[PDB]
Amino acid sequence: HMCDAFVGTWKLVSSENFDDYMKEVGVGFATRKVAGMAKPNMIISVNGDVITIKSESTFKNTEISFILGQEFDEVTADDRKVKSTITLDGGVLVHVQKWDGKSTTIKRKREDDKLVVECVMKGVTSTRVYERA
Ligand SMILES: O=C(O)[C@H]1C[C@@H]2ON=C(c3ccc(Cl)cc3)[C@@H]2C1
Numbered sequence: 001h002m003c004d005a006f007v008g009t010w011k012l013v014s015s016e017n018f019d020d021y022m023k024e025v026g027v028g029f030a031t032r033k034v035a036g037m038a039k040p041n042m043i044i045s046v047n048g049d050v051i052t053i054k055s056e057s058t059f060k061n062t063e064i065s066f067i068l069g070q071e072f073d074e075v076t077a078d079d080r081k082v083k084s085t086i087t088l089d090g091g092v093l094v095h096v097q098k099w100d101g102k103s104t105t106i107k108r109k110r111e112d113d114k115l116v117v118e119c120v121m122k123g124v125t126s127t128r129v130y131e132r133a
Helices: 018-025 029-037
Strands: 008-016 041-047 050-056 061-066 072-075 081-089 092-099 102-111 114-121 124-132
Touching: 018 029, 018 114, 018 124, 061 072, 061 081
Parallel strands: none
Antiparallel strands: 008 041, 008 124, 041 050, 050 061, 072 081, 081 092, 092 102, 102 114, 114 124
């Protein structure tokens, strides 16, 4: 019953500062423009110890499956090849991505009926709010 309140199908309803987050990460112009238009659905499921997070949009479809605390390799929507580790910290899914000596952290939390996603790279934060689909 690990992660029960995250499981389901979620739709993006608002984004703030995502262009600047993508800039900070190193995403190029054309990818930022197309990625920034997307209104993904995020589909979270759990089977035993394995959590799966899918993101589907007109821009890209991504899927990760993982065990908490156990590093895995991820190809991000912008084609970075990163090493990822996801843990639960006080009810928040904390996702760290490492690549080329760089690091970004993505937090996912349940707040009221929303799933709030906070993406941080150095001093730049973006907040993306999802609602149940
Ligand atoms: O809303 C979300 O799912 C957040 C968390 C995800 O993890 N990485 C994202 C990302 C990075 C670069 C690009 Cl170009 C697009 C998307 C997603 C944005």
